[PDB]
């Protein structure tokens, strides 16, 4: 629990002030893809025109973050957009992938 709470807080603090990002959990807060894009943008703003993204386009947003993180950051695409854009995606799968972002952006 302390580790999960710490990871949640890390995500909230990195994405503070991003419009249309509201991270309160490791499931529905992630299903529209905006939060993944905000985490990448905070560290690599060269990779995303965040202002262009809209919550309604879950598949586009998810694929955008997953593909950019694979191609430019070397982070394997553990998640499929179709699995994540459901109403109630799986917490463990999302945490495993977010931990890869946390380790990458927190080291180097």
User: All domains of the chain, ordered by start, with CATH?
Assistant: 1-108 (1.10.418.10)
Q: What are the residue ranges of helices labelled H in the chain?
A: 2-14, 34-43, 58-73, 81-84, 91-105
- What is the C-alpha separation between 5 and 45, in angstroms, rounded? 26
Is residue 74 within a helix (H) or strand (E), and if so which, with residue range? none
What count of Cα atoms within 13 Å lies in the side-chain half-sphere of residue 89?
A: 26
- What is the C-alpha separation between 88 and 53, in angstroms, rounded? 22
- What is the C-alpha separation between 36 and 61, in angstroms, rounded? 8
- Deposited experimental method: X-ray
Q: Which residue has the tokens 């919550």?
A: 55
To one decimal place, what's the resolution in Å? 1.1
- What is the C-alpha separation between 36 and 32, in angstroms, rounded? 9
């Amino acid at each position: 629990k302390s580790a999960k709470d710490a990871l949640l807080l890390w995500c909230q603090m990195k994405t503070a002030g991003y419009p249309n990002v509201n991270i309160h959990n490791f499931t529905t807060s992630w299903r529209d893809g905006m939060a993944f894009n905000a985490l990448i943008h905070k560290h690599r703003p060269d990779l995303i025109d965040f202002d262009k993204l809209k919550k309604s386009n879950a598949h586009y947003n998810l694929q955008n973050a997953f593909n950019l993180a694979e191609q430019h950051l070397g982070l394997t695409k553990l998640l499929d957009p179709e699995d994540i854009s459901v109403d109630h995606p799986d917490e463990k799968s999302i945490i495993t992938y977010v931990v890869t972002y946390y380790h990458y952006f927190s080291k180097m």
